[PDB]
Copies of this chain bind each other. A is one copy, B any other.
Amino acid sequence: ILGFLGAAGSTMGAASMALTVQARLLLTVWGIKQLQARVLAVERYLRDQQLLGIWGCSGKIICCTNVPWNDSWSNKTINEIWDNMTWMQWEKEIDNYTQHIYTLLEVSQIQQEKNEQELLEL
């Protein structure tokens, strides 16, 4: 495609395709500095994997969930988002409610394996 971050100024619909390109390259004064950045790299990465895990998205690149889109977050249509705004434009507009939706995905996953546990009781 375009490379690493190649579709940063592209529409959210075009950048959403081939997301495995920004998924690969995500993971003594010189020595201590270099080892300092090596440990931090694994920490920031595992935090994202920790989040994807407690959402049911562990292993997913595109992951649909149960939480409905509250129009208080953004009253924009799908067409005026994915075919117009860029991924950097979008999450500045959602920046406030981003911490609210992280909590919603976690309860929708703990109230999904708990309903799944009763399902396999029969």
Contacts and interface: CB of A to CB of B under 8 A. Distances in A.
A74 interface: no
A19 B110 contact: yes
Interface of A: 17-20, 23-24, 26-27, 35-36, 38-39, 42-43, 45-47, 50, 53-54, 56, 58-62, 64, 106-107, 109-110, 113-114, 116-117, 120
Contacts of A62: 113-114, 116-117
A90 B58 CA distance: 29
Contact of A59 (B35, B46, B53): B53
Contacts of A23: 50, 53-54
A20 B109 contact: yes
Closest 4 A/B residue pairs (Cβ): A58-B59, A20-B106, A20-B54, A62-B113
Nearest to A28: B32
A35 B34 CA distance: 13
Given A53-B59, A110-B20, A117-B64, A38 B43 contact: yes
Contacts of A45: 46
Contacts of A53: 23, 59
Contacts of A24: 50, 54
